[PDB]
Paper text:
Interleukin 4 (IL-4) is a pleiotropic cytokine that plays a major regulatory role in the immune system. Signal transduction of IL-4 is mediated by a sequential binding process, initiated first by binding of IL-4 to its high-affinity single membrane spanning receptor chain IL-4Rα. This intermediate ligand receptor complex then recruits one of two possible low-affinity receptor subunits, the common gamma chain (γc) or the IL-13Rα1 chain, into the functional hetero-trimeric complex to initiate signalling. The overall structure of IL-4 comprises the known four-helical bundle in up-up-down-down topology, which like the crystal packing is unaffected by these mutations.
Residue numbers in the entry: 1 to 129
Write the structure that this text describes.
């Protein structure tokens, strides 16, 4: 369960997300990693899934993000698709929706995704020989 291939699905998606630059990866999300984190693994997954759902919900049709060129629009649609895929996997791992996020600090989506990737790679490392 805790070392399920979902971890690989999450890292794969994060790898695509962080290789991605778009108009809006500099817009912010609540920094769940600014905590003196006193949180189970499941609550951290819930936390990350919550802020990302807020992000894609709010920015899927945002004029700063949608793009002028074909390439920009394609990259925006890919970003939203990947955030939904990441989120779907995170909720699967969380096993809950009740996890208030209290942090004041905001980070760019870019920085938040990089930190999440580091955390996920560490979990994978701890699962593997």
């Amino acid at each position: 369960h805790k070392c399920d291939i979902t971890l690989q699905e999450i890292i794969k998606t994060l790898n695509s997300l962080t290789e991605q630059k778009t108009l809006c990866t500099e817009l912010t999300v609540t920094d769940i990693f600014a905590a003196s984190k006193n949180t189970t693994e499941k609550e951290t997954f819930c936390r990350a899934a919550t802020v990302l759902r807020q992000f894609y919900s709010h920015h899927e049709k945002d004029t700063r993000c949608l793009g002028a060129t074909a390439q920009q629009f394609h990259r925006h649609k890919q970003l939203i698709r990947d955030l939904k895929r990441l989120d779907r996997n995170l909720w699967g791992l969380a096993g809950l929706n009740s996890c208030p996020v209290k942090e004041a600090n905001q980070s760019t989506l870019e920085n938040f995704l990089e930190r999440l990737k580091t955390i996920m790679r560490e979990k994978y490392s701890k699962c593997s020989s």
